[PDB]
Amino acid sequence: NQYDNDVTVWSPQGRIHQIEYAMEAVKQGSATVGLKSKTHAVLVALKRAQSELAAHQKKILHVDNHIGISIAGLTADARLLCNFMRQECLDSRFVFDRPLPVSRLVSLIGSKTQIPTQRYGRRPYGVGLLIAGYDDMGPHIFQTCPSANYFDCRAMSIGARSQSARTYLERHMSEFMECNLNELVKHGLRALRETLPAEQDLTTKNVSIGIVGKDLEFTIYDDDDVSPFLEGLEERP
Amino acid sequence: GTGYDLSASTFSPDGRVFQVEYAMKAVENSSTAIGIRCKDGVVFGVEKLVLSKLYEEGSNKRLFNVDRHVGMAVAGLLADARSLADIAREEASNFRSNFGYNIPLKHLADRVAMYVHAYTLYSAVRPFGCSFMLGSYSVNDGAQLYMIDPSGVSYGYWGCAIGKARQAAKTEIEKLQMKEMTCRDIVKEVAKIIYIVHDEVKDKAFELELSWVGELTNGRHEIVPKDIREEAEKYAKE
Amino acid sequence: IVKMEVDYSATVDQRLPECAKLAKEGRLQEVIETLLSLEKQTRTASDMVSTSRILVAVVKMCYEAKEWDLLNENIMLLSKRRSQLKQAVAKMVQQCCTYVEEITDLPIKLRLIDTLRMVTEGKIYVEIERARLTKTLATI
Amino acid sequence: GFDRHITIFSPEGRLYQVEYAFKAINQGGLTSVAVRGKDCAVIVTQKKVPDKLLDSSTVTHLFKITENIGCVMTGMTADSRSQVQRARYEAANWKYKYGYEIPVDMLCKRIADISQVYTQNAEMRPLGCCMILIGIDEEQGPQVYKCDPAGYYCGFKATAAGVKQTESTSFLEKKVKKKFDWTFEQTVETAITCLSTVLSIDFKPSEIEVGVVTVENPKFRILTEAEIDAHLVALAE
Amino acid sequence: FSLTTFSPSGKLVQIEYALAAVAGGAPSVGIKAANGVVLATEKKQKSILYDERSVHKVEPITKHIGLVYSGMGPDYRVLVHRARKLAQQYYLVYQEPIPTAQLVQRVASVMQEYTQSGGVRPFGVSLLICGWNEGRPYLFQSDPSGAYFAWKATAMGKNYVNGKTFLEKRYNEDLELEDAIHTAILTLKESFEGQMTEDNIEVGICNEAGFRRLTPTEVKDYLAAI
Amino acid sequence: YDSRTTIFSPEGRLYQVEYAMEAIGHAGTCLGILANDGVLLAAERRNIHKLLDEVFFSEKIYKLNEDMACSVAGITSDANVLTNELRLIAQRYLLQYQEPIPCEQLVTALCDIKQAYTQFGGKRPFGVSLLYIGWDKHYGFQLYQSDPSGNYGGWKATCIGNNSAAAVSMLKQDYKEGEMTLKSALALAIKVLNKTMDVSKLSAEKVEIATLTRENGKTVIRVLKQKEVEQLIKKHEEEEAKAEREK
């Protein structure tokens, strides 16, 4: 279609096509949800497994004691973004000894990812980021698309078949501020479980939880740590 | 078309740059905006599509604060818009560091327009897909308002609109009698014009981001207090 | 031709008859100049009826005060200032046509040729040509 | 192929890119007239202002490059402003490197050299804006020059640029062939009547902006509404 | 790529298109006489709006090096500026040789930045160089891609073929005095369409005393009695 | 099929380089013949338009060093820069070692630069092939031929011109090593140049020849001027007349 070949070129109908293709990178990825509360931010990621022998890969990456991210999509240029965010947060610690506020970090990520969308020979960072952080204004959940247009969200999910999780979160987002930690984690687990087909179900080995709170630094819970949250699942596949 | 609208460095057979002619289409497709120079200040206003209720209170706001007294209301591709806002902030900071005091709005608009023209001149880089208004007020220079197209140049505007429905907004803007109306009623009227522009006829519910600058704020471009301007939104609804 | 911007119908109504009284015998030219400024304001406001009334009043003042020479350069200035409004000048020639035919006099031949020179600058088929035909017949 | 797509020599032995840029100057819907006189040089261009929401105070196409040189721009406004900024930088740099003020011919030569560099290479593109610059020069009288997107800097006495530039140049050729020098009333009136005959609107004294540089009075006077109105009244008399 | 390029099997297609472009339409004849060299060209300005004392076709690169050119004048300006810088650099390095004709060959050789580093798009101007600081005159031509040719009489215009034919038939010869400028003007006359005048024709002469661009007075004087 | 210079072929050939080297055969004509106590170069002057002055004093033959000289046969634009680089390399070696550069080392450096030009980057191959004649302390008189492919060869009687095949065949037919001397080398060079140039009775102006000889502890590279060249032509003409009439 000629106009869809390169990122720099502009389509006659309006927006360019390469970035629109870039948003399909996050679409073709394992689902992940992230929701806010009054005091906590929780990420529920689907650890997609290659085979039963191999592990379920790694999601919900660690950035700092108060910030944790969940990737979705092209994993190659995603550890790069994780390194960039870690470096910026550590630079903030080194310069003025305070946790880098999540909004400023997300703005930095957007500015950094905007340049490849305009420089020839540089592909956009086709990675969807679900950043969970606890700045001084309570928990925060941010979604970063490869279009470098971030969003703030009470509860957002990205990945394959994530629309069902989005609908469930929207229908249940009213009762999100006033929820206990376990209650919110179970809300997220129900949201993620509704994404996969009925054959699949939540297991301790294929799920990951990232929780950050006022007194709780960011922690990545898995199978043994997930089991207390996985109890009381109310399984309706 | 065909081989001429591929890079900005390729001139058309008639002598046109089709890359910018297509970048303007993104601004034409994105949501609209409005900025009115009141008698003693400039009042902004932008409607923003809440594409999903999953989002929190108004985020990725089309309004930005590029300097202490200067604000930017942008429309189009929002990521490059934020990058250009960062560029404008850096330019204002550099000017304040070098020449002191506060950057005049005309010079800031000229410099950012020259930077945008530099980005649309070459071939490797692509023209910015955003159009924005720069509004500021000072006691010495009164109130100014400059609007920059994705490839054009800053122009002095008593009242301007950009985005999805430019002509529809501009008709009622020219209907409104500026240059003698205080910024309060101008806030009310920009909210009224935005609600006159279609919001839910074919889209979702829209939020009203309105900005302020003027002697009533002694410069210091800030977002209008939304709690007390909800009643202005109510008057606009009526 | 062009859309009206600012009407001065109230201004001309309240002032033109007062100006006529102030210059009943036409000894004052400041009255002529101030209506020239007023019709210039309406001309820049693109109003035709106000300009036409001003021109009709100006020539009517010259008729009653019988300044034949001052009429000649006055109508020359009016028709050559910026060409004004084609409706207004076409009107002004028409009442000039109606007036030159009632007073025999010696220099009406000069009045006839003066208006002929004002209309022969062009705009014959457009904006009244029967006046020029009548003037030429009047000269005959 | 790509002979007509990039700045490369055509098989027929031509350069099509600059040939397209020259027509790009015609694109935009504007015209300008430059007339050199016995002692002064005046430039006038129409001020096409759509709707009054614009600020007629700053919609101008004529600028002061230095204290004695003034330009008028024809073509795309962004490239016009960029070239005006470049010309101002060149004038300032010349005054810094060389004590005396930059001659208008030398400034035109430098701008044309920059434009020739632009039409050289292939990474960049020529700027679609034609600049006519005037200024008083000692031992030379008034001086008028034109720099084009190609790099050919020339033009004198009477020179015009814009959409209907050919008709204006023809009328000015007729006027200059009529052997009579124009004083500082006849030069302005000649320019005004040229631009009026090109575009017959009778030129209400608000839609044109004239720049004047005389010998007894230096500097680029951007004549106000009163001056242009007085000149128009004197001409239409 | 970023140099002189586009050379297929056995051809220099881009260079050939540059040579088609420099065919131009400005004859710019050059004659190497015994006493010196004459470079005469045609300034046929469009209409009378343009000026002839404002822009020049003949440029003195240094004290006794004069330069005339062909199509693509804007390229020629940059080329002559580069030539002036190169000659000045040579004179600064080898201080005070009064280098013109022991430099004319050298400056023609250093016209390798002229084309051997083309700059993506090669230059579209062919230039004739004259110098006489050796006790003997010199006439050299540099084309959009080649190098020095060391001409004795040539033309580089639209009718350069018939101009060169006229030059050889009129016997450019070797005993001709400095006033072979008459023959140069006659050669221009063949490739000229109009009544050539002092401002219409620009000519520079380079003799053993130096180089000088003839003012319109002498150009008209020579054009008289032709 | 051709593309950016640094490519291959489906078979595995450098068809751009091969095309350039074949194009070298087109246009230009130089030949070098090596003999004892003297090695010479013969060049064909392509354009003999009467409107030149011949002040450069050499077009094909270039003096590149005190002990060597070359002759290009490609496009002049690359030929000039290649000769400049070759002189620079020779003089750099002279500065570094305080000794004239051996001919083989100089030719290897030049062919290395040409191989680099055809190896990496989006740069055109140097479309020029040149001969070299020279003398050194180790191998004495030497002759080398380098092609744009960067693969030089140590020759003793070769041609690089348009009718290079015909010229080398004529050389092979009438070449005798050992017995060859400077005068016999001159005779053979003039004869083969007359063979490869269709117009018989070649003028001294259309042929430029240079001979390198070893004087007393010093290398002299003399280009044969017009009078000596035409005297050689006259001697060759006498030989041809005697040979033809004696049958």
From Swiss-Prot, chain A:
Placement of covalent cross-link Glycyl lysine isopeptide (Lys-Gly) (interchain with G-Cter in ubiquitin): K112, K205
InterPro entries: Ntn_hydrolases_N (IPR029055), Proteasome_alpha (IPR050115), Proteasome_alpha-type (IPR023332), Proteasome_alpha1 (IPR035144), Proteasome_asu_N (IPR000426), Proteasome_sua/b (IPR001353)
Induction data: Induced in breast cancer tissue (at protein level). Up-regulated in liver tumor tissues.
GO molecular function: lipopolysaccharide binding
Keyword Translocase tagged: no
Entry's localization field: Cytoplasm; Nucleus
An annotated GO BP: immune system process
Function field: Component of the 20S core proteasome complex involved in the proteolytic degradation of most intracellular proteins. This complex plays numerous essential roles within the cell by associating with different regulatory particles. Associated with two 19S regulatory particles, forms the 26S proteasome and thus participates in the ATP-dependent degradation of ubiquitinated proteins.
Protein name: Proteasome subunit alpha type-1
Organism: Homo sapiens (Human)
GN (gene name): PSMA1
Curated annotation (Swiss-Prot), chain B:
Species of origin: Homo sapiens (Human)
Superkingdom field: Eukaryota
Induction per the UniProt record: Down-regulated by antioxidants BO-653 and probucol. Up-regulated by bacterial lipopolysaccharides (LPS) and TNF.
Gene3D superfamilies: Glutamine Phosphoribosylpyrophosphate, subunit 1, domain 1 (3.60.20.10)
Keyword Phosphoprotein: yes
Family under the similarity heading: Belongs to the peptidase T1A family.
Gene designation: PSMA3
InterPro entries, A to Z: Ntn_hydrolases_N (IPR029055), Proteasome_alpha (IPR050115), Proteasome_alpha-type (IPR023332), Proteasome_asu_N (IPR000426), Proteasome_sua/b (IPR001353)
Keyword tags: Acetylation, Cytoplasm, Host-virus interaction, Nucleus, Phosphoprotein, Proteasome
Name of the featured protein: Proteasome subunit alpha type-3
Stored SUPFAM superfamilies: N-terminal nucleophile aminohydrolases (Ntn hydrolases) (SSF56235)
MF annotations from Gene Ontology: ubiquitin protein ligase binding
Swiss-Prot record, chain C:
Chain residue numbers at which the record places covalent cross-link Glycyl lysine isopeptide (Lys-Gly) (interchain with G-Cter in SUMO1): K80
S-S bridge residues: none
Residues in cross-link Glycyl lysine isopeptide (Lys-Gly) (interchain with G-Cter in SUMO2): K80
Subunit details: Component of the 19S proteasome regulatory particle complex. The 26S proteasome consists of a 20S core particle (CP) and two 19S regulatory subunits (RP). The regulatory particle is made of a lid composed of 9 subunits including PSMD12, a base containing 6 ATPases and few additional components. Interacts with ERCC6.
Function: Component of the 26S proteasome, a multiprotein complex involved in the ATP-dependent degradation of ubiquitinated proteins. This complex plays a key role in the maintenance of protein homeostasis by removing misfolded or damaged proteins, which could impair cellular functions, and by removing proteins whose functions are no longer required. Therefore, the proteasome participates in numerous cellular processes, including cell cycle progression, apoptosis, or DNA damage repair.
Connected disease: Stankiewicz-Isidor syndrome: A neurodevelopmental disorder characterized by delayed psychomotor development, intellectual disability, behavioral disorders, mild dysmorphism, ophthalmologic anomalies, feeding difficulties, deafness, and variable congenital malformations of the cardiac and/or urogenital systems.
Family note: Belongs to the proteasome subunit p55 family.
Name assigned to this protein: 26S proteasome non-ATPase regulatory subunit 12
Swiss-Prot record, chain E:
Record PTM Phosphoserine, positions in chain: S7, S9
Cellular component terms (Gene Ontology): cytoplasm; cytosol; extracellular exosome; extracellular region; ficolin-1-rich granule lumen; nucleoplasm; nucleus; P-body
Pfam families: Proteasome (PF00227), Proteasome_A_N (PF10584)
Location(s), subcellular: Cytoplasm; Nucleus
Residues found modified as Phosphotyrosine: Y17, Y69, Y114
Record's keyword annotation contains Phosphoprotein: yes
Entry's Gene Ontology BP terms: proteasome-mediated ubiquitin-dependent protein catabolic process; response to virus
Quaternary structure, from the entry: The 26S proteasome consists of a 20S proteasome core and two 19S regulatory subunits. The 20S proteasome core is a barrel-shaped complex made of 28 subunits that are arranged in four stacked rings. The two outer rings are each formed by seven alpha subunits, and the two inner rings are formed by seven beta subunits. The proteolytic activity is exerted by three beta-subunits PSMB5, PSMB6 and PSMB7.
Function: Component of the 20S core proteasome complex involved in the proteolytic degradation of most intracellular proteins. This complex plays numerous essential roles within the cell by associating with different regulatory particles. Associated with two 19S regulatory particles, forms the 26S proteasome and thus participates in the ATP-dependent degradation of ubiquitinated proteins.
Protein name as catalogued: Proteasome subunit alpha type-2
